[PDB]
Amino acid sequence: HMSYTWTGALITPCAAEESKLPINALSNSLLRHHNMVYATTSRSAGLRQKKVTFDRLQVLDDHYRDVLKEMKAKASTVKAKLLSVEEACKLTPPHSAKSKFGYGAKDVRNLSSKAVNHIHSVWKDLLEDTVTPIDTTIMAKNEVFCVQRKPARLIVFPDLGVRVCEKMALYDVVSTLPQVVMGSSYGFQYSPGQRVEFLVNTWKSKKNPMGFSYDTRCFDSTVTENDIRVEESIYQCCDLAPEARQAIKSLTERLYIGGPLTNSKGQNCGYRRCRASGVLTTSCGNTLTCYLKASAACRAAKLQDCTMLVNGDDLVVICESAGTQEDAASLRVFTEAMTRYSAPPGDPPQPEYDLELITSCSSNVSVAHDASGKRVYYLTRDPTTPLARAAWETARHTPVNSWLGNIIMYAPTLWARMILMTHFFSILLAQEQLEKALDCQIYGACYSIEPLDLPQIIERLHGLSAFSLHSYSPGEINRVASCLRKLGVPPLRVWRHRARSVRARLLSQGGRAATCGKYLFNWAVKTKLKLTPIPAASRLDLSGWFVAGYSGGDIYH
Numbered sequence: 001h002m003s004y005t006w007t008g009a010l011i012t013p014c015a016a017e018e019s020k021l022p023i024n025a026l027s028n029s030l031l032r033h034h035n036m037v038y039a040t041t042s043r044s045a046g047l048r049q050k051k052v053t054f055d056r057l058q059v060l061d062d063h064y065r066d067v068l069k070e071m072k073a074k075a076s077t078v079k080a081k082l083l084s085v086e087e088a089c090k091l092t093p094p095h096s097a098k099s100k101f102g103y104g105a106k107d108v109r110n111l112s113s114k115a116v117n118h119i120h121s122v123w124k125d126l127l128e129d130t131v132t133p134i135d136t137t138i139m140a141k142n143e144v145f146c147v148q149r150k151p152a153r154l155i156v157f158p159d160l161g162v163r164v165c166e167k168m169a170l171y172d173v174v175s176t177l178p179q180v181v182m183g184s185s186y187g188f189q190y191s192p193g194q195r196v197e198f199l200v201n202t203w204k205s206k207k208n209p210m211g212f213s214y215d216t217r218c219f220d221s222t223v224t225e226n227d228i229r230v231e232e233s234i235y236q237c238c239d240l241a242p243e244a245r246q247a248i249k250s251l252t253e254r255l256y257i258g259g260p261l262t263n264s265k266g267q268n269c270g271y272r273r274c275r276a277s278g279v280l281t282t283s284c285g286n287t288l289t290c291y292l293k294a295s296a297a298c299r300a301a302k303l304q305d306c307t308m309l310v311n312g313d314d315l316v317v318i319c320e321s322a323g324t325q326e327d328a329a330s331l332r333v334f335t336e337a338m339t340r341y342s343a344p345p346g347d348p349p350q351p352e353y354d355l356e357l358i359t360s361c362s363s364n365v366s367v368a369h370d371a372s373g374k375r376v377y378y379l380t381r382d383p384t385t386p387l388a389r390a391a392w393e394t395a396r397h398t399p400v401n402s403w404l405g406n407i408i409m410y411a412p413t414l415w416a417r418m419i420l421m422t423h424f425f426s427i428l429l430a431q432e433q434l435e436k437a438l439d440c441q442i443y444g445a446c447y448s449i450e451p452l453d454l455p456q457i458i459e460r461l462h463g464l465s466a467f468s469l470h471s472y473s474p475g476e477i478n479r480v481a482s483c484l485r486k487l488g489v490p491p492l493r494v495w496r497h498r499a500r501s502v503r504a505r506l507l508s509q510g511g512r513a514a515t516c517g518k519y520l521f522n523w524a525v526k527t528k529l530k531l532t533p534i535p536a537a538s539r540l541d542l543s544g545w546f547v548a549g550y551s552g553g554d555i556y557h
């Protein structure tokens with residue numbers, strides 16, 4: 001029961017790959033320790049292949065089937081619709097990988113006859129054939145990190161034609177099913193502010209709260225054939241059109257369970273028997289499977305009043321404590337149960353008795369004060385990776401602007417406000433690109449966002465307090481300051497100085513730019529302005545935001 005089988009053919013790049021941080025005239029104003037920053041390339045794919053290749057063994061007990069029966073009962077209340085070819089085409093990202101059948105992502109979006117005729121023939125093939133393994137491309141992701149070097153992560157995706165078909169059959173399913181099955185436990189339905197609110201209310205709902213996060217080692221590769229068939233049986237509980245039932249069965253048998261792996265040069269690299277990281281169902285499948293295995297593991301470990309917070313393979317558990325020594329024992333039993341279910345740990349889980357000390361996927365709850373002096377909880381993270389990616393994006397244009405996604409999601413943080421907003425607004429002013437729409441990712445989905453709309457977006461996700469936070473925690477200030485010394489980033493006093501200039505420059509431009517100056521950089525001036533709700537914020541169509549996760553799902557708006 002190996003996750004993969006390999007032939008020896010290399011995982012090849014699509015274009016020229018850079019690993020060393022590119023340097024331009026702007027680099028040194030952000031980061032001076034250039035040797036600390038790197039991008040992963042196909043050169044390291046061989047090491048990743050070794051790490052993700054292992055035998056999986058599953059032992060399914062009564063807690064597992066009990067949880068599954070409950071999940072299927074909730075899944076049976078879901079009614080899902082088939083999307084038209086047109087609706088599926090419009091969710092396709094403009095720069096999505098082109099089809100091997102002579103058309104690209106822009107042909108799909110333009111509803112070109114060639115693209116639409118091919119999608120219709122793939123659809124007919126899914127309906128008539130439910131056995132033939134569907135070909136997939138295996139690629140090394142190009143992602144930027146700070147040292148202390150990770151090997152490249154792998155992306156496995158079917159052809160553009162198949163991806164449009166996945167949208168037709170499962171887009172409505174993967175968007176509505178998880179919240180119905182998991183209720184308040186489904187993390188992707190929340191904005192960062194709603195997530196903090198959920199975590200605080202849960203922490204306060206326990207007499208003696210205890211919390212931990214569970215890190216599964218190579219989650220996608222731990223996903224078995226059984227897990228993928230179980231996900232299909234959950235999707236089948238929905239009230240679906242008979243063509244949608246057939247397409248879901250076919251995509252499961254032919255694509256989701258496994259298939260051959262092809263490199264960018266057309267060579268066979270091997271065969272997958274685990275979760276594909278670049279399919280529509282990656283996020284939803286990972287969410288349901290993680291929740292199923294964790295919920296059953298919580299019952300097996302006799303964890304009292306367990307509240308899950310699940311986003312794909314990201315798992316947070318908040319429960320009733322039984323003292324430090326018993327909690328240590330319970331987590332070992334939880335881990336043992338997760339292991340039997342083929343979800344073994346990377347780093348073993350540690351019990352926490354302070355909400356701020358629970359870290360999941362580099363993120364944690366922290367505290368600051370609003371304009372009135374009131375204590376306000378917000379989500380932050382270690383800023384090393386966001387700052388390393390910002391340095392790369394200072395010298396190179398990338399398909400996904402991590403700085404923009406980071407300003408949106410981490411707007412209330414000390415580091416996004418003082419550094420990211422200051423730096424990138426300074427660049428956009430000099431380049432006359434304030435009105436240019438830029439792509440970023442929110443919960444794996446791609447969005448086109450104009451930086452001039454940032455104050456309204458921030459107000460809608462975090463409220464006006466994101467523009468007024470002050471008196472950050474000494475733990476948080478210290479992590480930011482330590483990160484700056486490590487990377488060779490100028491100190492916070494330099495950023496405050498530069499921000500007064502960026503603010504004045506934005507105010508001079510008037511209009512939406514002046515609003516950016518007023519709201520985003522009010523923290524920089526000694527005589528603060530009283531910030532009132534922005535009328536444009538209410539007009540913002542933020543539907544489709546915070547519904548579901550679509551990581552690897554090829555989703556645009």
Ligand SMILES: COc1c(CCc2ccc(NS(C)(=O)=O)cc2)cc(-c2ccc[nH]c2=O)cc1C(C)(C)C
Pocket residue numbers: 191192195282283284286287311312313314361363379405406409410441442443444549551
């Ligand atoms: C953790 O929440 C997240 C997640 C969720 C991350 C996540 C995605 C997928 C999986 N797993 S998978 C691949 O199986 O679907 C797990 C976690 C993402 C972000 C975020 C930050 C900056 C830009 N864009 C963003 O979306 C922020 C949070 C906040 C809300 C903490 C700020």
